[PDB]
Write a protein that binds this ligand. Structure first.
Ligand SMILES: Nc1nc2c(ncn2[C@@H]2O[C@H](COP(=O)(O)OP(=O)(O)O)[C@@H](O)[C@H]2O)c(=O)[nH]1
Ligand SMILES: Nc1nc2c(ncn2[C@@H]2O[C@H](COP(=O)(O)OP(=O)(O)O)[C@@H](O)[C@H]2O)c(=O)[nH]1
Ligand SMILES: [Mg+2]
Ligand SMILES: [Mg+2]
Lengths: 442, 451
């Protein structure tokens, strides 16, 4: 019973994602050497060129398409502390969508960054994907980030400390601005190609004594990339987060009173708690909690429960309101929210003002796309334009949104089940999205 | 601690699938009156009126393009169960949902209208009643309830004669499909008026109730709701003959040959005499390991390395299906018939087309020998026999022949080994499930000493 970990590999195109990932798979014995060859030969037939290592990540991306997993046993490998699985990487039709719909869900993002001359500079430029990729992971609340500083073999000189330092520094400042805390991220210099420093230290890099993480949960340190992999913190576990319980229904049960029903998404609900309902802003005390027609002292995450509340009318709270704890990040009305969406098969064209209904947790409310803030390439996460005038089917984007009626939502990283939504026009699912920030009301 | 149960509702266009599901939902109190009202008001924009209907309409709509946000609206409670309405025909992703099994059903409620001519349309070779039933059987669903709907509108109103005719006629058809009609409850309802859904109807004094006789114990009832409570849960995969798709096969020093894989069905234990398809090669299992520890049994859903004496690494491979040689041994496959939906492929699939089939851990080029059928993706409606070509958005029935040797099963018998994707370079072009597999004639042995 080692715990399961999900890894997403990101980084700018040609920075070395498939190479590194494939090498790692090879070196960890997840596939037998015979079977590694079948797929090497097979890849060569299929494409012009050599696919040693890379075929692994390429097969993976391709097996995350249209919406069937048939097998993922090749992508599972064992470290000392975890069973790790590679989930997905940028560079295919569905990447953004898999990320956004949670069909591909990750506990950590390995961000590959290329150290070769001009390579790092391209990834981090206006045409590069390094920032976007980091930004995307953060948005999806992947709070564990490892940075693999790759192709060290081909710096100027080979394996330059100075170059490693320069990348660690510049990349640290960006991931800071973005919201990660740099000190928690292992910056590991490596060569995906030769293998340097993936499983043990490399004779080529004697100047490198190792990396140090400092987190809330305590310090850790190592040399290789395997060791970084094993300092990954697990989630954060819903039970330990403040209460969030979106309202499915509200009944008036005779000689008992108002009884809201819902799934505890995060936190504990218990009889006694004085809870708050957003966005109606009403605080009151839970007389009791029922599940399977039986009193509960605790309602845990995943529990569907009735709870009787004193002094509230059935007309005061409704489906889609959100209940939480009044003395622990009580829920609030969303004045507006910023999100990342991928537009699926629409009719035509969307502009500031478009107001479809947003289905989020148990709410169903029309929201205005106030500002269209970025268009984003769905294959790659690459940003393709600031304030685009209009979006259309196939685009990913970043949009600002203003709820038409009062609504309560949460950012996807704080409260996932309250941070993912679908966008709807009649029976049309036009978009799916996740919520970056939310401006709370007063 | 009632187990969870997914229902899908099928039936000819206009049999009353909408009205019945709506009514059931309204009357089981899973949604409160104001919410109902909100979605009733809301539906009244997107024409006279349209009662109970918005319930399915909505559900169908929210089963498009691979996000489900919330499904609390369609869960409801029964004495014995929590039941969710999972999907229904009449929308883009219906057949896909079903084939991919994102929508998987524990039981199918088949609605069947009973007005003059309605039934006969539905049950003709131009009618979806048979096709939906057949579709269900293909997918291993398993349990079937038939709601003989619209009883209020028979001639005369609520005819027992009419109800028996439909029962007799539909039971014959589903016997032909493979279903044991003795096991299927046939409930006369009126989804519109409510008659016989939650409780017996004063309008059907003649109806003394329905009976079913299964392997796993007889039962009887009167209402739809009771019928829902007969549904038996999952066959429980551990009861089945061992199937263990090979992920990898390692040489290990001082032990020999450790195939690794995951038990999909049945049990593996040390000292079993096990066949490997397609290669047809028997042997004994000396060791069974998981998490670096030997195992007494390896259960379904277990990822296990296991040591076999008698066999060199290069005899077996990834793609091979290991099973029990004294309990339905896994044969090789000659050809197999399958149902498939084609997703964004560029060209035009013609007879003899030859892409790779991923299926369990197998990876093998198969030939689209024959193109038996072309099917509507919204509705399951068989649209054409032996079509010249298949394009995007088409479902189909196709005969299939492997290039290399291959072991596959029918979805209904061994699910994890009966659903496949069709891959063409780094593109996924189709997904499907296997109806019939035409096994291999092929003599036992090697039985390599172990006997
Ligand atoms: N010199 C050198 N080349 C590398 C290294 N890693 C990858 N490459 C090459 O850089 C190119 C891009 O690698 P690939 O893994 O395909 O990049 P991806 O698109 O980010 O997956 C390929 O030619 C790789 O062989 C490395 O560490 N050193
Ligand atoms: N008289 C009668 N009419 C019904 C009944 N169930 C449905 N209908 C009507 O028959 C038509 C079929 O409705 P619908 O539920 O949409 O069928 P679906 O297309 O299979 O979902 C509609 O006009 C309904 O009003 C019933 O039990 N009795
Ligand atoms: Mg590349
Ligand atoms: Mg209709």
């Amino acid at each position: 019973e080692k715990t399961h970990i999900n890894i997403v590999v990101i980084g700018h195109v040609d920075s070395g994602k498939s190479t590194t990932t494939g090498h790692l798979i090879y070196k960890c014995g997840g596939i037998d050497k015979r079977t590694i060859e079948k797929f090497e030969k097979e890849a060569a037939e299929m494409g012009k060129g050599s696919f040693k290592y890379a075929w692994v990540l390429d097969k993976l991306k391709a097996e995350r398409e249209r919406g069937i997993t048939i097998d993922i046993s090749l992508w599972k490998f064992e470290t000392t502390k975890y069973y790790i699985t590679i989930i997905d990487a940028p560079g295919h039709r569905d990447f953004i969508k898999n990320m956004i719909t949670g069909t591909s869900q990750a506990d950590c993002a390995v961000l590959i960054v290329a150290a070769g001359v001009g390579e790092f500079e391209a990834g981090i430029s206006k045409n590069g994907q390094t920032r976007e990729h980091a930004l995307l992971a953060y948005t999806l609340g992947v709070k564990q980030l490892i940075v693999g500083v790759n192709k060290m073999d081909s710096t100027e000189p080979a394996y330059s400390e100075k170059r490693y330092d320069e990348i660690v520094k510049e990349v640290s400042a960006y991931i800071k601005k973005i919201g990660y805390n740099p000190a928690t991220v292992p910056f590991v210099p490596i060569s995906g190609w030769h293998g340097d420093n993936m499983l043990e230290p490399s004779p080529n890099m004697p100047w490198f004594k190792g990396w140090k993480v400092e987190r809330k949960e305590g310090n850790a340190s190592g040399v290789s990339l395997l060791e970084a992999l094993d300092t990954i913190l697990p989630p954060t576990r819903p039970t330990d987060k403040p209460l969030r319980l979106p309202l499915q229904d509200v009944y008036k049960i005779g000689g008992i009173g108002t009884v809201p029903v819902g799934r505890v998404e995060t936190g504990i609900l218990r009889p006694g708690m004085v809870v708050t309902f957003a966005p109606v802003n009403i605080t009151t005390e839970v007389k009791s909690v029922e599940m399977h027609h039986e009193a509960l002292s605790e309602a845990l995450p995943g529990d569907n429960v009735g709870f009787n509340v004193k002094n509230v009318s059935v007309k005061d709270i409704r489906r889609g309101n959100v209940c939480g704890d009044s003395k622990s990040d009580p829920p609030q009305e969303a004045a507006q929210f910023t999100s990342q969406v991928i537009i699926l098969n629409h009719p035509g064209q969307i502009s500031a003002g478009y107001s479809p209904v947003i289905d989020c947790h148990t709410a169903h409310i029309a929201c205005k796309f106030a500002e269209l803030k970025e268009k984003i390439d769905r294959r790659s996460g690459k940003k393709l334009e600031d304030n685009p005038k209009s979006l259309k089917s196939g685009d990913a984007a970043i949009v600002e949104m203003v709820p038409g009626k009062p609504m309560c939502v949460e950012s996807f990283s704080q409260y996932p089940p309250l941070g993912r939504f679908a966008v709807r026009d009649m029976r049309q699912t036009v978009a799916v999205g996740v919520i970056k920030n939310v401006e709370k009301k007063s």
